[PDB]
Write a protein that binds this DNA or RNA. Sequence first.
DNA 1: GTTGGATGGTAGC
DNA 2: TAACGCTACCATCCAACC
Length: 341
Amino acid sequence: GIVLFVDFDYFYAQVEEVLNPSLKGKPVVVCVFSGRFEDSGAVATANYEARKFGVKAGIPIVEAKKILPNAVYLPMRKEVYQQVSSRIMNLLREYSEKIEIASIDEAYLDISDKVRDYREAYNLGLEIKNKILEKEKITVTVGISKNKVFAKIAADMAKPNGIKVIDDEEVKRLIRELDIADVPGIGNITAEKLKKLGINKLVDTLSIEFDKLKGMIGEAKAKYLISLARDEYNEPIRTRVRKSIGRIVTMKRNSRNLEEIKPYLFRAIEESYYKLDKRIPKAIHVVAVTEDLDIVSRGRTFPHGISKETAYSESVKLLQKILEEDERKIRRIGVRFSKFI
DNA sequence: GTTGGATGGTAGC
DNA sequence: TAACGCTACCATCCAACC
Ligand SMILES: Nc1nc2c(ncn2[C@H]2C[C@H](O)[C@@H](COP(=O)(O)OP(=O)(O)OP(=O)(O)O)O2)c(=O)[nH]1
Ligand SMILES: [Ca+2]
Ligand SMILES: [Ca+2]
Ligand SMILES: [Ca+2]
């Protein structure tokens, strides 16, 4: 198998640089302004010039402005970015129809039938990079390896504006040498737990009793790590099938008054239901972010599909359930649809 | 004995 | 100092179904 993974560089900020070339080469910070007070909200993403000064995805806009007051601050235009993305995913389909879109800015291509070895895979990667540059003026990072996980690791090593092959021999090397926290699917919590068992590299999973690994990080993560360690991880590339679609919005001010929260909930529903595009969901969850930023939800699965009308009725009840069973004020409110027919 | 819904945790797999 | 937005997959706990 040969997998080619593509991830667009500083995507939203880069799209804004393409739409306004005079922004290029100086700090650009793409923001979601929440309206709670002047400059309330969070950074969605920043370009690399901005990142050098600590302005990155997830920090507050007021914190960013304290560091880079002279940066260019642009509101998030997600619809514009989705259009560029979709045009790029369609360019990627011309190189292989076996495509797994994994996010708004990344995809895995199985090119096993389009190229014969890694040398040709590398040349195709450069071809892909050059094409997206010609058509969309977007730079990307390409990772190439024998499976999805290592193609991902290869891109991570190579970003930004990179291309990198991890061949069979280097996979064997990384199984021994790569820090296990840098393996996709291993964050802070799982890494810490693995340290307590003395597992720092993938290779170390081959030494521990299966039930002890399973007991600490669970069956699925244990199977996954051992499979990578054996070099027998072989998840095929498959067409993305979206499993849930949702929208959460932020309120001008925290509240537990149902009548004040309803307008927001209902906008979340309108936007979410529009995003369904023909899909008919059987489950609905109302999702609230409380005043202390804890996430709570209540949901319901129906034996049949949920109409817009039923979504309205049922979401109000689920919001009432949250209010009755949780003391806290609500900061953000939204909805998630799943279990599509 | 399973199956799967409700809720939440982990990691962007 | 304040913290927006989006989603797949898994774990635990529990009721329903044999
Ligand atoms: N609103 C919001 N959007 C985010 C957040 N994180 C990522 N995104 C969106 C904006 C990014 O441009 C886009 C792609 O995510 P990536 O993780 O690949 O980061 P990005 O491409 O911006 O930087 P890149 O060079 O990979 O490092 O997804 C976030 O915390 N909030
Ligand atoms: Ca990216
Ligand atoms: Ca990405
Ligand atoms: Ca990690």
